[PDB]
Design a protein around this ligand. Structure first.
Ligand SMILES: CO/N=C(\C(=O)N[C@@H]1C(=O)N2C(C(=O)O)=C(COC(C)=O)CS[C@H]12)c1csc(N)n1
Ligand SMILES: CO/N=C(\C(=O)N[C@@H]1C(=O)N2C(C(=O)O)=C(COC(C)=O)CS[C@H]12)c1csc(N)n1
Ligand code: NI
Length: 341
């Protein structure tokens, strides 16, 4: 049974609702981005129109084998008509191909569905600013003040400087980055760039990255793993045992691994007050937990919502418990009272 927050009222549209069979009344299925929790259910046997970004369409065609006749890629920042309703797709600042959707309802209402997003002040000076938005379907992943983390730029600076120093001190070191989906490509691409290396990876991951329209990416990635100083591994292998086993590969041409894992999103006086990143180390293997996020921090989310001033907010994340629903509604009310909308 499709939850109500996945249906757009006054339309026959659903958003990220592919695991519920045939949704009654749905004439178009929007997919905000290619993450498993959102595309769950899509396959080569889906026979309804899917509306998405071009990059998401590339992944649907090449990774899930969705038939081309049902993939409807839409350009960003462009007014499009879908089944009699004007829509606009905007970059969500999440993972490649991820979009927010503006719906211009026939009754004059405007709805913004953020998909998954990392709110940024740049969104306030975009075409989002050119009309009132009445209802907001909000990515509330980190809707609590303890969710603080640096800008992606600060985190990438840390990772680049850490990896460059380690490999320049020890040219026999290897950098490993963990991955389980698309997104956070900047981490391993930036490290490989500063090291003059390509990123070695599995054929399956290589295929995935080939779908993302990343400029000059043939110059940055390879399936020849031992020829590179940066390797991508499945996230489940980013542990001392998994990295020890990997070090035994490639003829043992490396004697050190620095691994990067995205983690560490909670920081407050209650829990992990110090945000400074220090690796977990065992012998010649170090694992850096870096707070690289592709969701809004609490402050980023708050700023965006107080700028947008929506009349109604419908969370799309963390609404499975009464505690989380209640806390989120308290924050929305706080934000509304502070900003006066
Ligand atoms: C900075 O690292 N943050 C991590 C992570 O990758 N941690 C690591 C890992 O695996 N380790 C193991 C391990 O491999 O078991 C041990 C235990 O070994 C010792 C010290 O003797 C200690 S923590 C380290 C993390 C955050 S969320 C998650 N799933 N992992
Ligand atoms: C308003 O609450 N509506 C719910 C509900 O309990 N919602 C939830 C929420 O948020 N969840 C997330 C979440 O937090 O992300 C996922 C995760 O989903 C995936 C597949 O990633 C699964 S549903 C649970 C509901 C669920 S089924 C139904 N008819 N109503
Ligand atoms: Ni996502």
């Amino acid at each position: 049974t499709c939850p109500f927050y996945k249906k757009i009222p006054g339309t026959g549209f659903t958003v990220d609702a592919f695991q519920y069979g045939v949704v009654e009344g749905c004439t178009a299925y929007f997919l905000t981005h290619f993450h498993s929790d959102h595309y769950a259910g899509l396959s080569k046997h889906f026979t309804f129109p899917v509306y998405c970004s071009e990059i998401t369409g590339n992944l649907l065609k090449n990774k899930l084998h969705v038939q081309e006749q049902y993939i409807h890629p839409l350009p960003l920042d462009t007014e499009c008509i879908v089944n009699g309703v004007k829509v606009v797709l905007l970059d969500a600042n999440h993972c490649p191909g991820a979009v927010m959707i503006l719906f211009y309802l026939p009754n004059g209402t405007v709805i913004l569905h953020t998909g998954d997003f990392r709110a940024d002040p740049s969104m306030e000076r975009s075409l989002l600013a050119d009309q009132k938005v009445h209802m907001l379907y909000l990515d509330t992943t980190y809707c609590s003040p303890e969710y603080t983390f640096p800008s992606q730029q600060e985190v990438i600076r840390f990772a680049i400087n850490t990896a460059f120093e380690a490999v320049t001190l020890n040219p026999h070191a290897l950098v490993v980055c963990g991955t389980y989906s698309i997104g956070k490509e900047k981490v391993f691409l930036a490290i490989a760039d500063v090291l003059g290396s390509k990123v070695g990876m599995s054929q399956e991951k290589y295929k995935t990255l080939q779908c993302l329209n990343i400029p000059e990416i043939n110059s940055l990635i390879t399936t020849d793993m031992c020829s590179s100083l940066v390797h991508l591994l499945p996230m489940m292998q980013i542990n001392f045992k998994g990295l020890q086993s990997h070090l035994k590969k490639c003829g043992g041409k490396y004697n050190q691994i620095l691994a990067f894992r995205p983690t560490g999103w909670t920081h407050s006086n209650k829990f992990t007050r110090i945000a400074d990143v220090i690796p977990q180390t065992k012998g010649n293997i170090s694992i850096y937990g870096i707070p690289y996020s592709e969701h809004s921090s609490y402050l980023e989310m708050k700023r965006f919502v107080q700028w947008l001033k929506p009349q109604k907010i419908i969370p799309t994340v963390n609404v499975g418990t009464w505690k989380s629903r209640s806390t989120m509604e308290k924050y929305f009310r706080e934000w509304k009272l502070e900003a006066g909308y």
